[PDB]
XYZ file of C-alpha atoms in Angstrom:
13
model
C 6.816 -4.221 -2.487
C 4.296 -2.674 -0.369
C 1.728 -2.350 -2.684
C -0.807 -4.680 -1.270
C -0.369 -3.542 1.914
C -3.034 -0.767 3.335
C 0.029 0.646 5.819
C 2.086 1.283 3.110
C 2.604 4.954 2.352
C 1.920 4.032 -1.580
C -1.779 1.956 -2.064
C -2.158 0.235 -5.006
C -4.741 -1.923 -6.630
């Protein structure tokens, strides 16, 4: 869900 997002806790990509 929040994979794209750099705030996230989990980065991905």
């Amino acid at each position: 869900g929040c994979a794209s997002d750099p705030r996230c806790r989990y980065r991905a990509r």
